[PDB]
């Protein structure tokens, strides 16, 4: 069901984590993707944990959280202008769950690169109550 | 850190390899119009099998299954996926699996299982 955090807040948490990690990259670099994803995952976890936490600290952690982050390079032209256009490989990601339907949930964010950036980020957040 | 898998990993790898080949074993290449039914099939199979093989009494785990079908790059890398979590390090965990296609197959499958005790 409903997330512990308003989706509009989730969206700027996720967007900030992505630009914090890859905002200054000129290009996709397979050597750095692990650090980048670490970073994005770390940032989003800390932040959703903070904004979840009731002001009454006598309340213990109400949710478990998982963050999956994916970085995908854009297609690279054969040579390595016209209108900008991004080539992408096809992909499809879905999720199923055996859950408490009223307490548990997921939310997704995409960080679409322009042609000059050369890569996209996709983020999935899962919350499990209690 | 992570809790012990409620199903042996070697069993998982074969629940997963089997769910994948059932859904995409006969496909000749990546076909985007079929990927949703392909994933629908892959996820349902894996989920049903782990629910079944994890419990003796009531159900004691929550499960989440994520499946991603990824088209190969044209032949003569390009994507990285990772997961972090805030759970119970003694009971909860995750397992991942790559069904790696050869060149003729033109696509990979990436599966993740998450289990949460009680």
């Amino acid at each position: 069901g409903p997330s512990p955090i308003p989706t509009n807040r989730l969206k700027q948490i996720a967007a900030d984590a992505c630009n914090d990690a890859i905002g200054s990259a000129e290009f996709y670099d397979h050597a750095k993707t692990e650090q980048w994803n670490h970073q994005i995952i770390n940032t989003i976890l800390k932040a959703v944990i903070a904004e979840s936490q009731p002001s009454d600290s006598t309340t213990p952690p109400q949710f478990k959280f998982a963050v999956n982050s994916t970085i995908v390079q854009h297609l690279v032209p054969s040579s390595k202008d016209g209108k900008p256009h991004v080539g992408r490989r096809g992909m499809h990601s879905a999720t199923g769950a055996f859950w408490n339907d009223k307490t548990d949930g997921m939310w997704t964010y995409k960080h679409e690169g322009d042609e000059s950036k050369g890569m996209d980020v996709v983020v999935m957040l899962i919350w499990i109550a209690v | 850190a992570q809790g012990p898998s409620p199903i042996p990993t070697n069993r998982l790898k074969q629940i997963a390899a089997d769910a994948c080949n059932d859904a995409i074993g006969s496909a000749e290449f990546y076909d985007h119009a079929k990927t949703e039914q392909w994933n629908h099939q892959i996820i349902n199979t894996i989920l049903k099998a782990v629910i079944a093989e994890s419990q003796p009494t009531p159900p004691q785990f929550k499960f989440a299954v994520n499946s991603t079908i990824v088209q190969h790059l044209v032949p003569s890398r390009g994507m990285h996926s990772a997961t972090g979590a805030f759970w119970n390090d003694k009971t909860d965990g995750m397992w991942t699996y790559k069904h790696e296609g050869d060149e003729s197959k033109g696509m990979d499958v990436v599966v993740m299982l998450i289990w949460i005790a009680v």
Binding site: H74, L75, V76, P77, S78, S79, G82, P84, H85, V86, G87, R88, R89, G90, M91, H92, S93, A94, T95, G96, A97, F98, W99, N100, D101, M106, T108, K110, E115, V122, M124 | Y30, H32, T35, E36, N39, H40, I43, L47, I51, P58, P59, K62, Q71
Partner: peptide
């Protein structure tokens, strides 16, 4: 208590790369 709910998505149809071509000088006559 705990059940099997509907499935959800992230999705990206394949899209061709923008190729970069090689050009001659160009002849004005």
């Amino acid at each position: 208590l705990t059940t099997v709910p509907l499935t959800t998505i992230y999705e990206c149809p394949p899209s061709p790369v923008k190729e970069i071509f090689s050009y001659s000088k160009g002849i004005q006559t």
